[PDB]
Design an enzyme around this catalytic site. Structure first.
Site, PDB file in Angstrom:
ATOM      1  N   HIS A  83       0.872  -1.175   0.000  1.00 54.07           N
ATOM      2  CA  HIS A  83       0.000   0.000   0.000  1.00 54.07           C
ATOM      3  C   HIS A  83       0.910   1.226   0.000  1.00 54.07           C
ATOM      4  O   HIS A  83       2.128   1.099  -0.132  1.00 54.07           O
ATOM      5  CB  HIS A  83      -1.038  -0.036   1.142  1.00 54.07           C
ATOM      6  CG  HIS A  83      -0.498   0.153   2.537  1.00 54.07           C
ATOM      7  ND1 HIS A  83      -0.006  -0.884   3.300  1.00 54.07           N
ATOM      8  CD2 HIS A  83      -0.480   1.246   3.341  1.00 54.07           C
ATOM      9  CE1 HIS A  83       0.343  -0.429   4.493  1.00 54.07           C
ATOM     10  NE2 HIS A  83       0.063   0.861   4.544  1.00 54.07           N
ATOM     11  N   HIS A  85       1.694   3.837   2.103  1.00 51.94           N
ATOM     12  CA  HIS A  85       2.349   4.519   3.210  1.00 51.94           C
ATOM     13  C   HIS A  85       3.868   4.333   3.159  1.00 51.94           C
ATOM     14  O   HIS A  85       4.396   3.437   2.503  1.00 51.94           O
ATOM     15  CB  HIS A  85       1.821   4.009   4.548  1.00 51.94           C
ATOM     16  CG  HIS A  85       0.411   4.417   4.839  1.00 51.94           C
ATOM     17  ND1 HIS A  85      -0.417   3.692   5.667  1.00 51.94           N
ATOM     18  CD2 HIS A  85      -0.316   5.475   4.409  1.00 51.94           C
ATOM     19  CE1 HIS A  85      -1.595   4.289   5.736  1.00 51.94           C
ATOM     20  NE2 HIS A  85      -1.560   5.372   4.982  1.00 51.94           N
ATOM     21  N   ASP A  87       6.080   3.183   5.169  1.00 49.22           N
ATOM     22  CA  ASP A  87       6.693   1.918   5.543  1.00 49.22           C
ATOM     23  C   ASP A  87       6.603   0.875   4.433  1.00 49.22           C
ATOM     24  O   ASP A  87       7.181  -0.207   4.576  1.00 49.22           O
ATOM     25  CB  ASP A  87       6.073   1.380   6.839  1.00 49.22           C
ATOM     26  CG  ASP A  87       4.554   1.250   6.788  1.00 49.22           C
ATOM     27  OD1 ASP A  87       3.852   2.113   6.230  1.00 49.22           O
ATOM     28  OD2 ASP A  87       4.046   0.264   7.365  1.00 49.22           O
ATOM     29  N   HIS A 148      -6.952  -1.630   6.335  1.00 52.29           N
ATOM     30  CA  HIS A 148      -6.034  -0.626   6.860  1.00 52.29           C
ATOM     31  C   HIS A 148      -5.924   0.566   5.921  1.00 52.29           C
ATOM     32  O   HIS A 148      -5.769   1.708   6.373  1.00 52.29           O
ATOM     33  CB  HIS A 148      -4.665  -1.277   7.074  1.00 52.29           C
ATOM     34  CG  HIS A 148      -3.552  -0.303   7.284  1.00 52.29           C
ATOM     35  ND1 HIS A 148      -3.276   0.263   8.511  1.00 52.29           N
ATOM     36  CD2 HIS A 148      -2.637   0.203   6.424  1.00 52.29           C
ATOM     37  CE1 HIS A 148      -2.243   1.078   8.397  1.00 52.29           C
ATOM     38  NE2 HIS A 148      -1.835   1.058   7.142  1.00 52.29           N
ATOM     39  N   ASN A 179      -2.681   4.181  13.584  1.00 51.63           N
ATOM     40  CA  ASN A 179      -2.511   4.626  12.202  1.00 51.63           C
ATOM     41  C   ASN A 179      -3.640   4.106  11.314  1.00 51.63           C
ATOM     42  O   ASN A 179      -3.434   3.371  10.346  1.00 51.63           O
ATOM     43  CB  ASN A 179      -1.149   4.205  11.652  1.00 51.63           C
ATOM     44  CG  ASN A 179      -0.898   4.740  10.259  1.00 51.63           C
ATOM     45  OD1 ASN A 179      -0.457   4.012   9.371  1.00 51.63           O
ATOM     46  ND2 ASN A 179      -1.200   6.017  10.055  1.00 51.63           N
TER      47      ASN A 179
END
Ligand code: R9K
Ligand code: ZN
Ligand code: ZN
Ligand code: ZN
Length: 231
Positions: A83, A85, A87, A148, A179
């Site tokens: 995804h 983000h 990280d 998420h 988050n």
């Protein structure tokens, strides 16, 4: 012997071998005054490696490539970000400069662009509707629906029965949500159900952050997400 957040200095990367030709990579990062662990995956494809997710930033991802060369000695030729983000895509530019072909879904690529994060070069087609699956060399990529994030993918290694859930799946030691600004709380439990229905044979389940476990991580995550829903 899985390394935990307290054991890994920010800037160092660890590798953990799960099966013949399957490793996780573990890094740590500082954010808003705390330190968080992060996982990704490494899957052997003949004499090359497939990488799943960066090590959260350019410096960590450079160390990741150095640890791969030291401990495995095969070249990383492709990478997939699960995804948008940091990280997952932070360090994509390091990978591209190293000659790695970087991949993400069109949704991930658009969301990364809007957010100002690094954008994988190549596009994964065929993953836009919930329940879609596509083969990608030694793994299967699966879009379970929004959780998420709206774009999160999960990765399955059929040769080893390893399910990489990414940040849609929580480790057991997380008993409250975090988050979730980009999450779809209403759909997250349904998306987890799709994972269970599609990969009921999974033996090793890897969350985006923290300790791996079994398919009970899916029930754990449902419990935590529903509790946050009712906050
Ligand atoms: C993008 C980002 C930055 C800082 C922290 C996180 C977490 C996190 C992970 C473990 C526990 C608590 C939190 Cl907030 C996640 C995540 O849950 O995916 N993403 C993050
Ligand atoms: Zn995330
Ligand atoms: Zn995450
Ligand atoms: Zn639990």
């Amino acid at each position: 012997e899985y390394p935990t957040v307290s054991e890994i200095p920010v800037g160092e990367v660890r590798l953990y071998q799960i099966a013949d030709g399957v490793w996780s990579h573990i890094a740590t990062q500082s954010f808003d005054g705390a330190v968080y662990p992060s996982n990704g995956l490494i899957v052997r494809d003949g004499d090359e490696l497939l990488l799943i997710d960066t090590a959260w930033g350019a410096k960590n991802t450079a160390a990741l490539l150095a640890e791969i060369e030291k401990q495995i000695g095969l070249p990383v030729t492709r990478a997939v970000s699960t995804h948008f983000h940091d990280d997952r895509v932070g360090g994509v530019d390091v990978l591209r400069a190293a000659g790695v072909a970087t991949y993400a879904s069109p949704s991930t690529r658009r969301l990364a662009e809007v957010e100002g994060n690094e954008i994988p070069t190549h596009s994964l087609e065929g993953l836009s509707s919930s329940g879609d699956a596509v083969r990608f060399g030694p793994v299967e990529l699966f879009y379970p629906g929004a959780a998420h994030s709206t774009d999160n993918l999960v990765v399955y290694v059929p040769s080893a029965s390893v399910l990489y859930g990414g940040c849609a799946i929580y480790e057991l030691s997380r008993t409250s949500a975090g988050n979730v600004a980009d999450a779809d709380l209403a759909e997250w439990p349904t998306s987890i159900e799709r994972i269970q229905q599609h990969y009921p044979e999974a033996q090793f389940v890897i969350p985006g952050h923290g300790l791996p476990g079994g398919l009970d991580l899916l029930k754990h995550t449902t419990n935590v997400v529903k509790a946050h829903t009712n906050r």
